[PDB]
Ligand SMILES: Nc1ncnc2c1ncn2[C@@H]1O[C@H](COP(=O)(O)OP(=O)(O)O)[C@@H](O)[C@H]1O
């Protein structure tokens with residue numbers, strides 16, 4: 127019964143900012159954030175006895191390892207990115223909004239952006255070879271088939287910001303791992319988003335996506351400047367779902 | 368599922384595919400899930416890369432990728448076989464050529480120990496494994512284990528007999544390391560896992576060091592009867 131809406135857009139477009147403010151408008155609205163923290167500090171579960179005397183230690187930073195050496199670390203990062211996402215998304219689908227009249231769960235990105243934007247771009251850039259790309263897609267396909275329609279989207283909200291805006295916002299936010307990202311990299315990700323969500327020319331292995339409704343919102347302005355009209359557009363869009 | 372799931376464990380070229388292929392023929396109630404080794408030497412969706420070779424040749428670069436794919440393809444194969452085969456059989460048994468537990472606590476673990484995977488790769492692999500099995504752990508849980516015991520020297524010889532190109536450079540001491548993990552898991556039972564049910568699972572240990580021209584009859588009957596106790 128929970129409607130599932132993906133917020134899509136480039137790095138530092140303003141997705142987290144927008145959606146976590148937006149969700150306050152209704153007790154029936156919740157967000158699943160992207161597990162970026164879990165990527166910059168890699169941890170696995172402690173044993174039940176061990177956790178009582180041993181601290182959960184800071185782990186490696188796979189996000190940073192990927193940015194430093196994408197040709198070595200991209201496949202590892204993308205596999206983990208998508209696994210951590212699915213785990214978090216399924217749990218919120220299963221455990222939240224059990225008392226909502228019109229429950230909406232907003233996902234910060236989707237398994238589709240993992241594959242068709244980010245990993246695809248890494249492949250195109252030869253940061254993943256043929257074997258890695260085949261394995262990744264094989265895995266991604268298998269996992270999607272395993273769930274029925276459970277993660278399937280009801281709608282996508284595309285926050286469209288220029289590569290230049292995103293580059294500035296990466297600096298504003300100050301994530302250490304992202305400070306070396308050049309404009310050329312953001313432009314590549316921009317183009318993939320435009321093909322997928324705006325021009326709608328991008329073909330995926332998931333045919334329902336060809337027909338999922340998409341709301342495109344320009345987020346280039348300062349947050350106060352367009353927020354009202356954005357909220358109005360979002361609410362009108364949800365009414366149609 | 369009411370399908371009995373039995374894992375066949377043992378070192379490289381101990382004789383597991385050979386044994387399970389013999390076993391299979393005893394009843395129409397018995398099926399096998401082989402390791403999809405062909406998918407590992409020829410990477411393809413559903414002539415590609417040989418990720419088995421890439422791992423053996425460059426294990427600090429390729430071990431994690433290989434271990435992830437191997438386990439993923441096993442879970443895929445094992446689940447398919449449950450979903451479709453036997454079910455409606457009298458006393459269904461499914462024999463697995465290895466398990467998700469040997470993937471992790473034998474193969475991947477040895478790679479981490481040998482520094483072929485770093486801390487980050489090992490932590491990611493364990494997180495991946497815990498989760499992948501939290502969904503599919505229940506449906507794949509083992510009823511029994513058959514441990515096919517062969518010396519590292521026997522295994523090295525059989526690697527030669529079989530002639531898989533990728534394996535011809537594996538040294539005796541690599542086989543020794545895998546042997547020690549098997550014995551610790553299945554004989555000494557000193558290897559502890561994240562899966563508490565396993566400590567309860569009965570194990571039939573079979574010595575397969577001898578030429579099969581010899582004592583194979585006893586072994587097979589001895590399985591037929593182990594399964595009666597389950
Ligand atoms: N419309 C906006 N105007 C000014 N700053 C913004 C706007 N939207 C987001 N930000 C800021 O830009 C940075 C990136 O936003 P964030 O929501 O973290 O992006 P994303 O979730 O898409 O990666 C943050 O520092 C946030 O303060």
Ligand SMILES: Nc1ncnc2c1ncn2[C@@H]1O[C@H](COP(=O)(O)OP(=O)(O)O)[C@@H](O)[C@H]1O
Pocket residue numbers: 377378379380381382383384385386525526528529530575576577578579580
């Ligand atoms: N008991 C045995 N005696 C003689 N040869 C054997 C015996 N078991 C296996 N072999 C041979 O050894 C090789 C490895 O056996 P295989 O069943 O493929 O091993 P695994 O599946 O354990 O890797 C094959 O060439 C096989 O014909």
Ligand SMILES: Cc1cn([C@H]2C[C@H](O)[C@@H](CO)O2)c(=O)nc1N
Pocket residue numbers: 137160162189204207235239240241244245304
């Ligand atoms: C989903 C996702 C995100 N990122 C990066 C972009 C940001 O630097 C950080 C947070 O989204 O992770 C990535 O490389 N690949 C992905 N599949």
Ligand SMILES: Cc1cn([C@H]2C[C@H](O)[C@@H](CO)O2)c(=O)nc1N
Pocket residue numbers: 379402404419434437438465469470471474475534
């Ligand atoms: C399951 C499994 C197998 N192998 C190797 C041993 C053999 O060379 C080949 C076929 O089992 O793959 C491996 O390195 N890691 C695994 N998790």
